Design a protein around this nucleic acid. Sequence first.
RNA 1: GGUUUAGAACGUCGUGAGACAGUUCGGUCCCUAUCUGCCGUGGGCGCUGGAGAACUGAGGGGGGCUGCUCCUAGUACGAGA
Length: 132
Amino acid sequence: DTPILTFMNKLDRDIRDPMELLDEVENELKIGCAPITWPIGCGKLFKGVYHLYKDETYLYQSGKGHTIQEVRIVKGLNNPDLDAAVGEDLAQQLRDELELVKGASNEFDKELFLAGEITPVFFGTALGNFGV
RNA sequence: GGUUUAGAACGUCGUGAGACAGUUCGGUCCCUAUCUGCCGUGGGCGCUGGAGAACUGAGGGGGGCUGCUCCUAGUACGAGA
Ligand SMILES: [Mg+2]
Ligand SMILES: [Mg+2]
Ligand SMILES: [Mg+2]
Ligand SMILES: [Mg+2]
Ligand SMILES: [Mg+2]
Ligand SMILES: [Mg+2]
Ligand SMILES: [Mg+2]
Ligand SMILES: [Mg+2]
Ligand SMILES: [Mg+2]
């Protein structure tokens, strides 16, 4: 009955739909998904992750994987600086996906996590040292 | 330096002088450029009164190589490497 944290590695790479990634984790691993962060773009378009519970956006910088990059936050989820820093196009897809996410996922519950029934899912990149 | 002169020897051929597209050691490389051409550099005259400058630019030449590293990114691609 050991608890599981989930880390979605390799956001530097062109990946699958993180929605679909949640299905594969719930369906095939028989365990609930509770997103904590959410990727904004992937591959050449990875811009960072929006934290769902802190409501802010940590901005990914390319190739600082050897040390820890400068923590660069954009506060609001509708902050027009998220549009400026990420492009308003990608910024809306963040907003859209987040809508769908809330209707098909889970709030992180500490009790169910310790019971091994939901996993806190973090999206990141261990190579870029971002999300760790 | 090689190799078609003259010296000398070996093998080889020839009775021999010699000979071998066999080898071996030695062994004189001239020219003050008239013309053409070319690199530079002046003189003359022209250009329509003479002169001092600053120009335009028809055209002509020069130039034109490329390694490695880093960012993108160990991303696309790839099961990996
Ligand atoms: Mg791929
Ligand atoms: Mg001779
Ligand atoms: Mg002789
Ligand atoms: Mg003969
Ligand atoms: Mg002549
Ligand atoms: Mg030219
Ligand atoms: Mg030329
Ligand atoms: Mg040209
Ligand atoms: Mg293959």
